[PDB]
Design a protein around this nucleic acid. Structure first.
Ligand SMILES: [Mg+2]
Ligand SMILES: [Mg+2]
Ligand SMILES: [Mg+2]
Ligand SMILES: [Mg+2]
Ligand SMILES: [Mg+2]
Ligand SMILES: [Mg+2]
Ligand SMILES: [Mg+2]
Ligand SMILES: [Mg+2]
Ligand SMILES: [Mg+2]
Ligand SMILES: [Mg+2]
Ligand SMILES: [Mg+2]
Ligand SMILES: [Mg+2]
Ligand SMILES: [Mg+2]
Ligand SMILES: [Mg+2]
Ligand SMILES: [Mg+2]
Ligand SMILES: [Mg+2]
Ligand SMILES: [Mg+2]
Ligand SMILES: [Mg+2]
Ligand SMILES: [Mg+2]
Ligand SMILES: [Mg+2]
Ligand SMILES: [Mg+2]
Ligand SMILES: [Mg+2]
Lengths: 208, 294, 157, 169, 68
RNA sequence: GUCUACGGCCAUACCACCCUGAACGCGCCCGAUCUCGUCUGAUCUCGGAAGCUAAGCAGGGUCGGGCCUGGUUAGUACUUGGAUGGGAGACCGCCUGGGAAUACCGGGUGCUGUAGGCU
RNA sequence: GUUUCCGUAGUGUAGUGGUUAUCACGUUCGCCUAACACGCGAAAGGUCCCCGGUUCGAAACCGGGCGGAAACACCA
RNA sequence: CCGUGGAGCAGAAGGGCAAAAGCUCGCUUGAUCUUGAUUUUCAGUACGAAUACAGACCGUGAAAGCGGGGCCUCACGAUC
RNA sequence: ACGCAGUUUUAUCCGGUAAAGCGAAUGAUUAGAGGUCUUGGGGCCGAAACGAUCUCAACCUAUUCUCAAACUUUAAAUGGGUAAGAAGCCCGGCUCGCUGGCGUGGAGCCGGGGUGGAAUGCGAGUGCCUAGUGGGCCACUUUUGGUAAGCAGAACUGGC
């Protein structure tokens, strides 16, 4: 386990786990949702998300420790099934290690220069969302404090933003309450199906 | 619930071709039939297109340009009662007859009638058309089979033999004409002449008259509705070939106009389509208001 | 050290693009390739018998020889020393015309027509292609409405 | 009220899948010759088993296709053996049905002791006038939705002709 | 004792030191490399032009000079 | 206003389902004695013409799926050239120029050449 | 660390020149014996290291890991 | 019945291919002899490989045409 | 007057990188919902019963999260080739053993008529002989290996 000071801002092309890598071990994170996974859309109105500022690489172990800290503060503040946290970020870039000393100069110079896979990190663009927590209206400050506790644990500088959208959907919270009732949006689990008007008439007849 | 039938199949479906989806071309043989070698730069390559359809055969000569295909001459089977062959429009005799009419009409269009008489006395031999020095050269055309399987006895070869005896210098072999034996490699010109004149179906009409008069009246009906007897068929095609070779000029039809026209239904407009949708919306809302209460 | 074989960089270049696979169209063949025709080179993936090279894709040359079912084109290829006129034999499926010479012949025909009109009527024509001139002292119109005032917007994430 | 859209017998398939090649397979071909009056045609691999001793490219099955009045006669013999009692899962969704029989001497064959008892598959497809479009070489067109033969059409045809019983159990 | 392997630096400048040249001068293009059947056309056409062009072209030039 | 034969552009013209088709034509169909090739006249060939538009086919329709085109995305993401611009870096801002795409929305869905025939 | 080789019933192995579960010891049952050793006849016992790709078909051909066995690791 | 390439084309991949370059069947050795040109690597030298021609003798096909090895990218060798 | 250009414009073709996308093919990958053919774990109606009920399993449908140097429908900026005339147009005629329905096509040859045919800059073309060189380095930018290096290796331009 090498420090995160030597694996930082992007200096290589993305090298994913594929047909040509074949040697990367398992990532640290395996799951990506921690809260009420079966939460409906009208249950938790708002969401606060965590916006990066530096074009950096976040490691999977950092994502692990941050989601554990955020989950722990959420279950100590609003308890189980009072929140829904989703790590938006998924690690795919495989960093490499060129290890030596396997106190001698008589084993290997820079002869075999290409390295073996060490672990998985995640290339993060400027403005790309790290995490997103949807909660009730009364849990506004708790999401702020949870992502603030994750802020001290991610490297680099990043900000927090309470979204204008209604949860994880791409539609506005101002338009949601006035527009899901009349015509368009129908809830489908935790996601929302948006229907256009360019359908067959059997869909409109199945509605109403 | 089972299959993933058609999701992006329509979006990645490379359509083949208009004529291939209609099923009228192949293009793997058309790319070799049509395209002239480029040491000529303008010389058209003439193709006799012989298409057999139910009730009618079509014999044409065409070449190609970048805009489409240019047809110089064309002869049909429904024009044979103008030459004498009233009934039997798709027999091998009509194939030979349409090929002869096509060749005579092409040579009448080109003015090469007095020269290149061809094979007047129909014998069924291997009469290759030779060119004469000091005179305009022979017409070099090539066959088109289309999608028909060219086994021995196909009447596209009968139209070929009609064009060759009319005087079109088309290269051909004698091992796909009817009457060619398969085991013995020799060719039977008497059987080929018999099959041109149509004496085999004369023998089959004799067979039906001597075996089953009920079948002889069930099929072959229009024959005895006007008149068909085998000696008059043997004289009938013999006079029809002479009528073609004496008058191939193809008189046409006037066809001014008949100024009365409504058969097909035109399209409806965008506003009409949208108002159909609006009437459907209003009628469904009216039904949901009315029938749920009543 | 790149193992410079034939077509070692042609994963995308000699490929039929999208929704255009299958048999070759016949209007590619049915073209008039005389001598002096300024023609382009664009390689094909269907016909493998006449690929020019990976270096001559997209270039433009002059026809010197025509055969049964190919053509001969002289192409200026740039090498380390200096550009060279090279004599290539390319089949017909890989070749289309160039319309720049056709536009120049259209301009020559228009200039001959204007010169005929000039000799007829004594009218000066200015048949030289002058480039895009500076804008003249034209006169704008602002009737009916005042000009709309634009201001930059505040920053919102 | 129904212009020339008649549910007629298109063909009748006859199949015997012998577990080996040689004497029993040749005698099964002899049985199909005794039914049809014409020679059968053999089958082969695209599988290699190793559970009972056959290999790739061996004569596993014999089969034949009978069309016309002979097909109607052999269909009558098969429904006479089964006594006109099919089952509801015999009819396929494409309008075709098969049933199969054992004890081939029930078809009207004098039992030779050297041949033995071979079972025989009977598979019938239903045809309408206008099904040669999907088989002719020139213009292979589709059939259509209102013209294709379905499950209900096939079972109502079998209720109408030959006086059959569905046995829905 | 490892050395620098390969580069193309300071190469285009050496190319443009002497002014990269089009061949730029081919009037009456070179005739070799053309179809021998077309050569059997053209050479026999040229030598029978040398033989039998005299009197018809001479009288035609006299006719067009008299009409011009 | 159409169709047939050969086509050019290759989905504005493919796929699913439902209606319409007067007259030539296309077809389904009607049988193996010759030419023919098959286990099977099912496919391919041979002389038909008793019915039929049920199918192909040709039109129209689906708040149809796809395809083409136009707005939006967006003067955004990118980007030639420049600075003794900012910042520890990460990168970002400015001058001069060029400028894309998915979502979202709207419209169309064949055009024609040659030869021939129907109203 | 590098280069070769191996992994198969509880144990040591054979077997690919692709399409088996092979031998020997051990266990259980029964016999000979008064009873044991010895001997006999059967039976059970296999993830052919684990996970993937090639094909009609893999343990076999190949790859990534796992655990081992040999050889080298020298001059300053 | 659905089935636009999701199979196959000798092998490592890329490209390409559907009345096909794929599978099956029937005949055949054009995988023949010979002089030049051109492309590739390149110094515009050679070998190797390839392309379009030309002249004989042929194969197939009804003919159009196709074929002087393998659908293309490699699978090979100077003086004496 | 001809000609030339590390330049631009006007047209004309070429590409598949940045970007973007994967509710689009290939490859990965997250979560919830709806549907019911399927075999497999449970208890429940109960002599057993695809006679019937709930859930998990898997599949399908419509969504949704995140990517791809060896993925891609789309597709830049930058860049590459070509043309911008008198060596070019147009007319009339001879030759051909090439080709061929045709004085058909195509090449060659002869004669005649009209140069004011994008911007800016510049006087060009060509022959011979030969030294030195064949150890490089640095910088803005685009980049490969490496944690990084005043490290090693590439591209354009400039400099030592
Ligand atoms: Mg063919
Ligand atoms: Mg060096
Ligand atoms: Mg017979
Ligand atoms: Mg026969
Ligand atoms: Mg029949
Ligand atoms: Mg119809
Ligand atoms: Mg109808
Ligand atoms: Mg339509
Ligand atoms: Mg639509
Ligand atoms: Mg900059
Ligand atoms: Mg089908
Ligand atoms: Mg491949
Ligand atoms: Mg491919
Ligand atoms: Mg073929
Ligand atoms: Mg030859
Ligand atoms: Mg590339
Ligand atoms: Mg990218
Ligand atoms: Mg010196
Ligand atoms: Mg030195
Ligand atoms: Mg360096
Ligand atoms: Mg150094
Ligand atoms: Mg200096």
């Amino acid at each position: 386990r090498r420090p995160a000071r030597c694996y930082r801002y992007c200096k290589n092309k993305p090298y994913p786990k594929s047909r040509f890598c074949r040697g990367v071990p398992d990532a640290k994170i395996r799951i990506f949702d921690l809260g009420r996974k079966k939460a409906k859309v009208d249950e938790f109105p708002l969401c606060g998300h965590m916006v990066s500022d530096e074009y950096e690489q976040l490691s999977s172990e950092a994502l692990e420790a941050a989601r554990i800290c955020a989950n722990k503060y959420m279950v100590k503040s609003c308890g189980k099934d009072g929140f829904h946290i989703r790590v938006r970020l998924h690690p795919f870039h495989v960093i490499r290690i060129n290890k030596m000393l396997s106190a001698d100069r008589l084993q290997t110079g820079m002869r075999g220069a290409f390295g073996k896979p060490q672990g998985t990190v995640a290339r993060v663009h400027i403005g790309q969302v790290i995490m997103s927590i949807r909660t009730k209206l009364q849990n506004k400050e708790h999401v702020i404090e949870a992502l603030r506790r994750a802020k001290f644990k991610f490297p680099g500088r990043q900000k927090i933003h309470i979204s204008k959208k209604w949860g994880f959907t791409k539609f506005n919270a101002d338009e949601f309450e006035d527009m899901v009732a009349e015509k368009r949006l129908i809830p489908d689990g935790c996601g929302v199906k948006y229907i256009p008007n360019r359908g067959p008439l059997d869909k409109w007849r199945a509605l109403h | 619930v089972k299959v993933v039938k058609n999701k992006a199949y329509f979006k990645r479906y490379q359509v083949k071709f208009r004529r291939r989806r209609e099923g009228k071309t192949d293009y793997y043989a058309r790319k070799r039939l049509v395209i002239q070698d480029k040491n000529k730069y303008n010389t058209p390559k003439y193709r006799m297109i012989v298409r057999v359809t139910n009730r009618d055969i079509i014999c044409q000569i065409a070449y190609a340009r970048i805009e489409g295909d240019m047809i110089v001459c064309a002869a049909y089977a429904h024009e044979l009662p103008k030459y004498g062959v009233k009934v039997g429009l798709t027999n091998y005799a009509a194939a030979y007859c349409t090929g002869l009419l096509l060749a005579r009409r092409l040579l009448n269009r080109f003015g090469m009638d007095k020269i290149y008489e061809g094979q007047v006395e129909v014998t069924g031999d291997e009469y290759n058309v030779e060119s004469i020095d000091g005179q305009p050269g022979a017409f070099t055309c090539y066959l088109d089979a289309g999608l028909a399987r060219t086994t021995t006895g196909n009447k596209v070869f009968g139209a070929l033999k009609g064009a060759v005896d009319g005087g079109l210098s088309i290269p051909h072999s004698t091992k796909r004409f009817p009457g060619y034996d398969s085991e013995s490699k020799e060719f039977n010109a008497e059987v080929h002449r018999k099959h041109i004149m149509g004496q085999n179906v004369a023998d089959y009409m004799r067979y039906l008259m001597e075996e089953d008069e009920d079948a002889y009246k069930k099929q072959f009906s229009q024959y005895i509705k006007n008149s068909v007897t085998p000696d008059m068929m043997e004289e009938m095609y013999k006079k029809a070939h002479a009528a073609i070779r004496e008058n191939p000029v193809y008189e046409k039809k006037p066809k001014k106009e008949v100024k009365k026209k409504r058969w097909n239904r035109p399209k409806m407009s965008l506003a009409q389509k949208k108002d159909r949708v609006a009437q459907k919306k209003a009628s469904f809302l009216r039904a949901q208001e009315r029938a749920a209460e009543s | 050290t790149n193992t410079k074989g034939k077509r070692r960089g042609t994963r995308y270049m000699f490929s039929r693009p999208f929704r255009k696979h299958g048999v070759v169209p016949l209007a590619t063949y049915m073209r008039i390739y005389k001598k002096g025709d300024i023609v382009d080179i664009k390689g094909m993936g269907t016909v493998q018998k006449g690929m020019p090279h990976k270096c001559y894709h997209g270039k433009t040359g002059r026809v010197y020889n025509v055969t049964q079912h190919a053509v001969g084109i002289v192409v200026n290829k740039q090498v380390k020393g200096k550009i060279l006129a090279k004599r290539i034999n390319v089949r017909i499926e890989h070749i289309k015309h160039s319309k720049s010479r056709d536009s120049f012949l259209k301009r020559v025909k228009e200039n001959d027509q204007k010169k005929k009109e000039a000799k007829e009527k004594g009218t000066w024509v200015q048949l030289k292609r002058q480039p895009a001139p500076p804008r003249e002292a034209h006169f704008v119109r602002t009737n009916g409405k005042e000009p709309e005032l634009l201001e930059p917007i505040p920053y919102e994430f | 009220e129904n212009p020339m859209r008649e549910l007629r017998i298109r063909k009748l398939c006859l199949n015997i899948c012998v577990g080996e090649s040689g004497d029993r397979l040749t005698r099964a071909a002899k049985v199909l010759e005794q039914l049809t009056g014409q020679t059968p045609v053999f089958s082969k691999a695209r599988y290699t088993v190793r559970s009972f001793g056959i290999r790739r490219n061996e004569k596993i099955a014999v089969h034949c296709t009978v069309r016309g009045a002979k097909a109607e006669e052999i269909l009558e013999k098969g429904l006479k053996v089964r006594e006109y009692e099919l089952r509801k899962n015999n009819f396929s969704d494409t309008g075709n049905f098969g049933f199969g029989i054992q004890e081939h001497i029930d078809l009207g064959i004098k039992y030779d002791p050297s041949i033995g008892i071979y079972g025989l598959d009977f598979y019938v497809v239903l045809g309408r006038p206008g099904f040669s479009i999907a088989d002719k070489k020139r213009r292979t067109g589709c059939i259509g939705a209102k013209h294709r033969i379905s499950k209900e059409e096939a079972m109502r045809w079998f209720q109408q002709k030959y006086d059959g019983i569905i046995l829905p159990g | 004792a490892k050395s620098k392997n390969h580069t193309t630096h300071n190469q285009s400048r050496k190319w443009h030191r002497n002014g990269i040249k089009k061949p730029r001068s081919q009037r009456y293009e070179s005739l070799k490399g053309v179809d021998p059947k077309f050569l059997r056309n053209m050479r026999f056409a040229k030598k029978h032009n040398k033989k039998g062009l005299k009197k018809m072209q001479a009288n035609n030039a006299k006719a067009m000079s008299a009409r011009a």
